[PDB]
UniProtKB/Swiss-Prot annotation:
This is Carbonic anhydrase 2. Changing N59L: Reduced activity. Keywords: Acetylation, Cell membrane, Cytoplasm, Disease variant, Lyase, Membrane, Metal-binding, Osteopetrosis, Phosphoprotein, Zinc. Changing V118 to K/R: Strongly reduced CO(2) hydrase and p-nitrophenyl acetate esterase activities. The gene is CA2. Its EC number is 4.2.1.1, 4.2.1.69. The record marks Q89 as: Involved in the binding of some activators, including histamine and L-histidine. Changing V139G: Weakly impaired activity. Signal peptide: none annotated. It comes from Homo sapiens. InterPro entries: CA_dom, CA_dom_sf, Carbonic_anhydrase_a-class, Carbonic_anhydrase_a-class_CS. The record marks I4, N59, N64 as: Fine-tunes the proton-transfer properties of H-64. The keyword Phosphoprotein applies.
Amino acid sequence: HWGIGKHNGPEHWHKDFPIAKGERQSPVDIDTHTAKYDPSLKPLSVSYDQATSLRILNNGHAFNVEFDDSQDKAVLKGGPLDGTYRLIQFHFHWGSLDGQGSEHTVDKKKYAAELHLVHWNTKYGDFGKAVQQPDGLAVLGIFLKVGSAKPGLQKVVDVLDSIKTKGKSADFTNFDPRGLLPESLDYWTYPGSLTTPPLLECVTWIVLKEPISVSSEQVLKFRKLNFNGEGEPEELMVDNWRPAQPLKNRQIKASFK
Ligand SMILES: [Zn+2]
């Protein structure tokens, strides 16, 4: 069930997607005192210098910035991953208030928003085939807290007026996603799922410990988008996050002592 479309509340998804009650669902709470350092993890390699952004789309549940993934231009490797994973799109989840909005939590703390950079394993040839595999995707998660403005984010905030309603898109070329990363690449990792329908259990999650700060005025502009299509009754695009799901039989590993 991916693509342009409104979603109902996450508590109803299990009626259409039974995997919503599965064994490796995301997001989860990260208990920092139970995650174990893993000296086996190799260092993480983010290679975004040749990234090619194309378009920004309001898909009725978030906005996606889409990349050319027809070649290895923007890739993720190392860490817990085997193989090369190609960036296809990034998007955010955010709240109606600064005290809520993230999907993952850290010792039950909620951040104001969470950025997801989605990558697919090139040995499966394309995104559609990759989501049918347990190691098909790698999603880099980054928390946002409210404080100083993030310069690298402002070109994104600037174009949201042109994609206010469901189904609208705008050109979005030459955007450099390195401007959204924090200073440190220390992370937690665990096996999980997509956090929207169809909720497939195909993701290796890499969640960064250091948040980035964005300004109150930047997040206020996220809250002006609409879930609805033009000419329909107005619904503000807020609180588009899924709550923490049971960890079940999984261990969270840390890249740092
Ligand atoms: Zn997401």
